[PDB]
Ligand binder design. Structure first.
Ligand SMILES: CCNc1nc(Nc2cc(F)c(C(=O)N3CCOCC3)cc2OC)ncc1C(F)(F)F
Length: 259
């Protein structure tokens, strides 16, 4: 029975690097939210206050009491996308398409306010009560565009299986194609229930196989040809040849009506 101001901390929603996320219920008003408990945080809070979109987690405010900082956030009561992906199977293509559409709406939004998330993966993609997707966890996020000027990134971060090959090979790189790449790994995972490689490096046989277009192997053989054509445009090793979001939105599978 911990608590803070009027909120009871009632169960553990997740455990991060630093601290945890608790379900917080306001025993007066009965509203339930998510609270991140910690100890970088300054920057994180600053980014969180910018966010206003139906496919990104909303920020309500914070309290600083003692060592511990409390970040109050929208609750996504459906839990994570990670848990809707059956291992070795994925999920039905129409659910995968709808989630993808929503993930792109969120990414467009972030990029439009000049924020790169940098750790897009199914653990960070949460579902509200009607299965609406929300992009969560802004602890690795950063500003890549300010006063209409882009800056290149140089820090390596993210999660190896989701990371774009340039992030391992170039000293500096553009932000947007890295997020687009990780969305293509998410889409693979939804449609096949498996990640295609441990990392996109020259010493990873699975990545070499894909560059050599061996799509008779898994996970690619589990995927229908229309979504696979899109994946061919997303998972392109040269970031300036990689498809952009405006072009993803014209792709034939992206616009296919599904049941
Ligand atoms: C990763 C946790 N972060 C968040 N998590 C949630 N919600 C939930 C996350 C979950 F994972 C689960 C879940 O399914 N679990 C299994 C049952 O036991 C606990 C966890 C349930 C959630 O809401 C009820 N909302 C907002 C946040 C954010 F902090 F991002 F805002």
């Amino acid at each position: 029975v911990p608590f803070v101001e009027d909120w009871d901390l009632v169960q553990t929603l997740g455990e991060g690097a630093y601290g945890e996320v608790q379900l917080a219920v306001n025993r007066v008003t009965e509203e339930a939210v998510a609270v991140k408990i910690v100890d970088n945080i300054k920057k994180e809070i600053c980014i969180l206050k910018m966010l206003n979109h139906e496919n990104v987690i909303k920020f309500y405010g914070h309290r600083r009491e003692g060592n511990i900082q409390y970040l109050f956030m929208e609750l996504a009561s459906g839990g994570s996308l990670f848990d809707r992906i059956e291992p070795d199977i994925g999920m039905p293509e129409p659910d995968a398409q709808r989630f993808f559409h929503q993930l792109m709406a969120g990414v467009v939004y972030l990029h439009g306010i000049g924020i790169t998330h940098r750790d897009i993966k199914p653990h960070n993609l949460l579902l509200d009560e009607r299965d609406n997707l929300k992009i969560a966890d802004y602890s690795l996020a950063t500003v890549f565009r300010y006063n209409n000027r882009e800056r290149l990134l140089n820090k390596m971060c993210g999660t190896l299986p989701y990371v774009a090959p340039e992030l391992l090979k170039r000293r500096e790189f553009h932000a947007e194609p890295v997020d687009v790449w990780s969305c293509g790994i998410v889409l693979t995972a939804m449609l096949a229930g498996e990640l295609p490689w441990d990392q996109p490096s020259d010493s990873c046989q699975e990545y070499s196989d894909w560059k050599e277009k061996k799509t008779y192997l898994n996970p690619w053989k589990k995927i229908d040809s229309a979504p696979l054509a899109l994946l061919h445009k997303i998972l392109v090793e040269n970031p300036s040849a990689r498809i952009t979001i405006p072009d993803i939105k014209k792709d034939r599978w992206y616009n296919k009506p599904l049941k």
